[PDB]
């Protein structure tokens, strides 16, 4: 589990979004596994605006942060999940690391701020849904 809180926005994994998230829907992309909902309370997170390919992510199944190298956001085939059919995910970044289903929502960060959230795992890879292109998260 996990979310990003920036301005009046909450960013979550689309497959973990709550009924309240859906009732307060701002934007969702199935192909990205992202949903953004509106919040009453001001969020304190900063979104990275950069092309970093290194950062640190939180891994809840290890209670650890890991430093990783990751690929630039791309269209990647992702195997079966209990929350998706075997499908193409877009804006996905892969690193070598540990990810289990409950690690989704873990934040990947660089010096510039939040890069993305854990979205995919298995076969010793961790996949992160990028948010850096969503420039609209940093205004109204
Ligand atoms: N192989 C490494 C080493 C360090 C980092 C890192 N430090 C801070 N943010 O990333 C990433 C990958
Ligand atoms: Zn960066």
Distance between first and last Cα of the chain: 26
For ligand 1, atom 3, name the residue with the nearest CA: 67
User: Residue 19 and residue 90: Cα distance in Å, rounded?
Assistant: 24
For ligand 1, atom 12, name the residue with the nearest CA: 68
Q: What SS3 string covers 24-73?
A: CEEEEEHHHCEEEEEEEEEEECCECCCCCCEEEEEECCCCEEEEEECCCC
Q: Which pairs count as long-range contacts for 23-27, CB under 8 Å and 24+ apart, including other chains? A: 27/134
Q: Is 44 a known ligand-binding residue?
A: no
Ligand at minimal distance from the CA of 51 is 2
**What are the Cα distances from residue 51, in Å, to 23, 83, 90, 97, 121?**
33, 29, 17, 20, 22
User: Residues 50, 110: contact at Cβ < 8 Å?
Assistant: yes
Q: Is 112 a known ligand-binding residue?
A: yes
User: Residue 72 and residue 117: Cα distance in Å, rounded?
Assistant: 14
User: Residue 114 and residue 96: Cα distance in Å, rounded?
Assistant: 19
Resolution (A): 1.3
Domain boundary assignment for the chain: 3-44, 45-140
Q: How far does the centroid of ligand 2 lie from the alpha carbon of residue 85, in Å?
A: 31
User: Residue 89 and residue 60: Cα distance in Å, rounded?
Assistant: 22
Could you list the active site residues?
15, 33, 104
Ligand at minimal distance from the CA of 96 is 1
Let me know the angle formed at the C-alpha of 84 by 137 and 70, rounded to the nearest 5 degrees.
55
User: Residue 6 and residue 114: Cα distance in Å, rounded?
Assistant: 10
- Residues in contact with ligand 1 (CB, 6 Å cut-off): 54-56, 67-69
For ligand 1, atom 8, name the residue with the nearest CA: 55
Neighbours of 120 (CB within 10 A): 24
User: Residue 8 and residue 73: Cα distance in Å, rounded?
Assistant: 25
Phi, psi of 81 (to 5 degrees): -135, 165
């Amino acid at each position: 589990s996990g979310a990003i809180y920036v301005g009046n926005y909450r960013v979550v994994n689309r497959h973990l979004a709550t009924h309240n998230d859906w009732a307060n829907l701002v934007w969702e992309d199935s192909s990205r596994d992202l949903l953004v909902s509106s919040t009453t309370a001001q969020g304190c997170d900063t979104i990275a605006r950069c092309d970093c390919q290194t950062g640190v992510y939180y891994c809840s199944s290890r209670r650890k942060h890991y430093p990783v190298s990751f690929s630039k956001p791309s269209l990647i085939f992702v195997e079966a999940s209990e929350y998706y059919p075997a499908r193409y995910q877009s804006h996905l970044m892969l690193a070598v690391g540990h990810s289990e289903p409950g690690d989704c929502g873990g934040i990947l960060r660089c010096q510039h701020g939040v890069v993305g959230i854990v979205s995919t795992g298995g076969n010793g890879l961790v996949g992160f849904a990028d948010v850096r292109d969503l420039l609209w998260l940093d205004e109204e």
